[PDB]
Symmetry: C2
Amino acid sequence: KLIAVIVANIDDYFSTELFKGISSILESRGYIGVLFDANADIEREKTLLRAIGSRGFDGLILQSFSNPQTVQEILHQQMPVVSVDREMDACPWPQVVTDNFEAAKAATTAFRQQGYQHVVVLTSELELSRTRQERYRGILAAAQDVDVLEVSESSYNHSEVHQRLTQLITQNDQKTVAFALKERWLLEFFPNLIISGLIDNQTVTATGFADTDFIRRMKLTLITQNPFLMGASSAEIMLRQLAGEKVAPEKMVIPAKLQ
Amino acid sequence: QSSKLIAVIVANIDDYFSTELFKGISSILESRGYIGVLFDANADIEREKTLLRAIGSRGFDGLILQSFSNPQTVQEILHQQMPVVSVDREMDACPWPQVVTDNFEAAKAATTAFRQQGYQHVVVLTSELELSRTRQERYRGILAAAQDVDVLEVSESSYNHSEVHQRLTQLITQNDQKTVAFALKERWLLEFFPNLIISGLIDNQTVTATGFADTDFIRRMKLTLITQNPFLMGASSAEIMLRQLAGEKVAPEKMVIPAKLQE
């Protein structure tokens, strides 16, 4: 009674917390969650997918980058599947996602209503993920002026990004809000900016999609996805699939919270 | 032909040390067709037992242990059906091979480096000492190098944030001796040091801070920290496992991966 859980990168708090959610729910039925690291590698995921399939795992909860076809061509309906945080197309199985566009929108609208009309979006490459595009789409629909700084998680230099970032925030003394689209960018760059004083909550402030209890205590307003809940919810769906209940391949939206 | 699945049980996946450990194990095991599988003990020794019972009744070909189970537990449940390698435990008289850090030497050297810069007063922040031999060793290393040493034990089970905060601030500020706040575990450094850097307490002139931590983002705050090289510890433990899987009667000795004090 093992459920394989493949995450994009076990180094993200979102992923380890999501897994803790699956586990918590799976334990109420004697089922056990098992974690696999796709290590941001399309190929590692493929070889992992084959192993998961041939070894007889009972279920697959997937928060990754491969098209549903890539997953069907390897597992071929031999087990229940639930994808998380990806919002893909023509998905033949259930999905649990955040209201990315909406949450980003509301966030941007709140900051706008406080004079911070300038927004600098710090994100990973947009075209590689649909949830990233949605968040950026949400910021675009409610922001007056927007500047974007895309970073390739596979090739970049800390100071190089740090400089282009300080730049975008201070080019105009327009009241700016630095908006991180993923937690790692918020943890890597904003702390220093708080110490240097650029982020004074007067002219410049900061926000982003972060779920870690320890950034908040340095107080900024962050958007949380509550990955634990998303993980718990996907596992409920998975219980239904193992129990035999034919499940509808629909999207379940766990709303984000601007706290 | 077998499962070729190696079970890896970590103390808690929330620890960056664990996830990196696993990454190390996975890159080595891959070179030979083996696949690391991650299990989360979630800080519960009971949880761990059911994971082990599952690991033995599903046919995994090996176990890499970075958790709480003693050998009596692992014997009674798995009965040596599969080779075992332990990591980051500092267990004496261990029956299987081990991969550990020079906890005493590393702490001692770090304290010595700080003393030479003037910091004579060490404020140790840690999870309960009795609960772990590795913590005890790092604490043992500090006392072996510093005069004025105060200790602040935190209960991972039930502790209050501002409660611990207020005490740390009390111990750091009691006298004029230059002080080093030394975290024995990464989480404590990550939870309590940032505000002390932002509030001005930690200024690198009268009060500085260090600890065992491998995460990069704190690096960028410039603090001097001790890294355990978890990826390397994980890869080394996987190298030993492959030797056992290849049928080598690997002696149950400890392989020491020295920690590095990195500015």
